[PDB]
Design an enzyme around this catalytic site. Structure first.
Site, PDB file in Angstrom:
ATOM      1  N   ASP A  34       0.817  -1.206   0.000  1.00 17.61           N
ATOM      2  CA  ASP A  34       0.000   0.000   0.000  1.00 17.61           C
ATOM      3  C   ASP A  34       0.857   1.265   0.000  1.00 17.61           C
ATOM      4  O   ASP A  34       1.416   1.675   1.033  1.00 17.61           O
ATOM      5  CB  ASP A  34      -0.951  -0.023   1.205  1.00 17.61           C
ATOM      6  N   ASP A 222      -1.628   5.483  -5.580  1.00 15.38           N
ATOM      7  CA  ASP A 222      -2.106   4.619  -4.497  1.00 15.38           C
ATOM      8  C   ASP A 222      -2.354   3.164  -4.915  1.00 15.38           C
ATOM      9  O   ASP A 222      -3.390   2.835  -5.464  1.00 15.38           O
ATOM     10  CB  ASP A 222      -3.378   5.226  -3.885  1.00 15.38           C
TER      11      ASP A 222
END
Ligand SMILES: COc1ccc2c(c1)[C@]1(COC(N)=N1)c1cc(-c3cc(Cl)ccc3F)ccc1O2
EC number: 3.4.23.46
Length: 373
Positions: A34, A222
């Site tokens: 992430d 992201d």
């Protein structure tokens, strides 16, 4: 870096994970990659959705920091107990580092029922680490304690639920993973991987918005988000234009809002009637930009008659360049030089007529004004 190629797995919509080991003797865990968060946090108790979890009692190198951490976020929360331990990445560099680990002890909507991962690897910067920026993120620890260069790169390739694959090259770039040249956009600030979008086109037609709207209140890269999320006003204009360009066929308003699917007879999806979408990003040079272009093969995601969801959605937290963008490109997180590189991915899905593209240079004035303050 052949040892790291193909080191990511996942299921469609459930994120990409890498194998890690924590503790001594080593405990193997699958960990969500992430770039949108900055904590290394691992399941530490027998939640029924988890295949495995960190058992601190079995590690000789575990150290307790005697501090809790509390992490509400927009779609859930997790909570836990801070400590340190030794950590390695079997399909990564041949090193072991002492990293901060949040042992997750309570959570809500964090773990996915059916997924094969048990923790999260936040690769963003200390500024957004919980509980504060004094908790050194994993990658900072890795770079400080070893000779691993300060950068990493991601090739996300996509696909009952289809398996996905990709590569996280830690400490460098694998040139086999892209075609053409890398093009770099500056990291505006080291918290999220924040970037500046300076222009948006649908099939080459400029949306003509104040470019501040594209980055209100931020734009980020992201790997922990599936969709291309756009600020509300930009989403409205984008969908209006995508509707117009594809008006050969008609769909309900709920399709565009992600409220329902569209289906075609297996193998007859009319890719050609859907437009390409281009984001111009701030370049390395004053008044210089480049553009990244994705296809409907990136933004119309298969849902398992061929059925699809429209994977561009609205955001109140800014532009989020999730998998819909990243699966078109090899993305270099060049932390050493505060910049992010995009190149056409050697694994991206395309057809005979169109390909995902990274093109430049273009002249774009006032790019600094596109940033939100
Ligand atoms: C403080 O910021 C946080 C904290 C926790 C947190 C996440 C962010 C999040 C949500 O968005 C991102 N980038 N990671 C996040 C994302 C996912 C997730 C990611 C993908 Cl690509 C797909 C499905 C998911 F549930 C699962 C958990 C998860 O947890």
């Amino acid at each position: 870096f052949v040892e790291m190629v193909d080191n990511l797995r996942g299921k469609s919509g459930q994120g990409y994970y890498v194998e890690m080991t924590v503790g001594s003797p080593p405990q193997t865990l699958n960990i969500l990659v992430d770039t949108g968060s900055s904590n290394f946090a691992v399941g530490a108790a027998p939640h029924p959705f988890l295949h495995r979890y960190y058992q601190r009692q079995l590690s000789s190198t575990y150290r307790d920091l005697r501090k809790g951490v509390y992490v509400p976020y927009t779609q859930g929360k997790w909570e836990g107990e801070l400590g340190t331990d030794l950590v390695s990445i079997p399909h990564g560099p041949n090193v072991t580092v002492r990293a901060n680990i949040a042992a997750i002890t309570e959570s809500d909507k964090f773990f996915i029922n059916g997924s094969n991962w048990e923790g999260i690897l936040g690769l963003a910067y200390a500024e957004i680490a919980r509980p504060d920026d004094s908790l050194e993120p994993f990658f900072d620890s890795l770079v400080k304690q070893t000779h691993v260069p300060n950068l990493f790169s991601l090739q996300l390739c996509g696909a009952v639920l289809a398996s996905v694959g990709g590569s996280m090259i830690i400490g460098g770039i694998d040139h086999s993973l892209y075609t053409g040249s890398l093009w770099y956009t500056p990291i505006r600030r080291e918290w999220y991987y924040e970037v500046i979008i300076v222009r948006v086109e649908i099939n080459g037609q400029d949306l003509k918005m104040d470019c501040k709207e594209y980055n209100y209140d931020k734009s980020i890269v992201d790997s922990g988000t599936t969709n291309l999320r756009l600020p509300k006003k930009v989403f409205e204009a984008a969908v209006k234009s995508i509707k117009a360009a594809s008006s050969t066929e008609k769909f309900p308003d709920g399709f565009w809002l992600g409220e329902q699917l569209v289906c075609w007879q297996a193998g007859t999806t009319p890719w050609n009637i859907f437009p390409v979408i281009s984001l111009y990003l701030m370049g390395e040079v004053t008044n210089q930009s480049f553009r990244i272009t994705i296809l409907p093969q990136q933004y119309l995601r298969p849902v398992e008659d061929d059925c699809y969801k429209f994977a561009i959605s609205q955001s109140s937290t800014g532009t989020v360049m999730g998998a819909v963008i990243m699966e078109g490109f090899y993305v270099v997180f060049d932390r050493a030089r505060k910049r992010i590189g995009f190149a056409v991915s050697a694994c991206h899905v395309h057809d005979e007529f169109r390909t995902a593209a990274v093109e430049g240079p273009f002249v774009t004035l006032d790019m600094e004004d596109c940033g939100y303050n």
